[PDB]
Amino acid sequence: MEQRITLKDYAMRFGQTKTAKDLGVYQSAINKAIHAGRKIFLTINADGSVYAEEVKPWPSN
């Protein structure tokens, strides 16, 4: 069973730094995605590995 958390909650509990590192992105991108409220969710695998995906309703608007 995977865990699945929003980018914002994840960063809030673990810190921007660790989040950036976990995803391998340039740190400031984290801060910007949050502040822009995008719909990004991280999946935490059982082996501890992490990936992110942006999710939108289909269809659109």
Added chain:
Amino acid sequence: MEQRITLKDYAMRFGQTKTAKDLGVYQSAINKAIHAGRKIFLTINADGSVYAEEVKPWPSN
């Protein structure tokens, strides 16, 4: 998209009280499931509603 969190992480971030209340269980049951390490995950719906389920590999051992 649902969020999905372990009982332990959920209680840790929100407090045992709110967890009990969220699930509608007798408070001390929370504490006992944790300390016994059962494999319990909460699903947080978009409308904000919460449910829990215990999960085991199939097949067994």
